[PDB]
C-alpha cells in the first residue's frame, strides 16, 4: 500500500 | 511533479435522468467490483505526490478512477451507460500503459477487467 500497487 | 487537479464528478448544467442501465451500472458493476479485493489501487486518483510517480501524469493523460465514476453514477453525471462504460475501460486501458505487464497491479486490473465484461454482458433492456 505504500506505492498504492506500483511496482517502483 | 504536483497532481493535476481530479476529473469533474458534477456539473448542474448537464441534464440528468434515471435508466434501468445506469441502475445496474452503479448497484451490480460499480458495486461488485468496489467489494472486490484488488479493488483498492483504484478506489481514487492516482496520488503522484503521496505515491512518488512524477511520471504518471507526463505518461497518462486521460486520468480515471472508480472513485471518480462512483462519484459520477451518485451525481447523476452520465446520461448513457456508454459514458460510464468507457471511463472503465480509461482506468483499465491507463493501468495497461503505465504499469509493465508482468507487474502485479496489471494482472490486478486484468481480474477486474474480466469480472466487469462479465457484469457488463448481463446489462438490461
Same mark, same amino acid.
Given at each position: ?8 | ?46 496520488? &503522484?505526490?503521496? #505515491? ?5 501524469? *507526463? !505518461?497518462?493523460?486521460? %486520468? ?44 490486478? &486490473?486484468?481480474? #477486474? ?5 462479465? *457484469? !457488463?454482458?448481463?446489462? %438490461?433492456?
Amino acid at each position: 500500500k505504500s506505492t498504492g500497487g506500483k511496482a517502483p | 511533479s504536483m497532481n493535476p487537479p481530479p476529473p469533474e464528478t458534477s456539473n448542474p448544467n448537464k441534464p440528468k435522468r434515471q435508466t434501468n442501465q445506469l441502475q445496474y451500472l452503479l448497484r451490480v458493476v460499480l458495486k461488485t467490483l468496489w467489494k472486490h479485493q484488488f479493488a483498492w489501487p483504484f478506489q481514487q486518483p492516482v496520488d &503522484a505526490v503521496k #505515491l512518488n510517480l512524477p511520471d504518471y501524469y *507526463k !505518461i497518462i493523460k486521460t %486520468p480515471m478512477d472508480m472513485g471518480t465514476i462512483k462519484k459520477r453514477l451518485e451525481n447523476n453525471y452520465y446520461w448513457n451507460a456508454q459514458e460510464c462504460i468507457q471511463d472503465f475501460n480509461t482506468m483499465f486501458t491507463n493501468c495497461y500503459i503505465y504499469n509493465k505487464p508482468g507487474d502485479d497491479i496489471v494482472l490486478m &486490473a486484468e481480474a #477486474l477487467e474480466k469480472l466487469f465484461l462479465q *457484469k !457488463i454482458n448481463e446489462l %438490461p433492456t
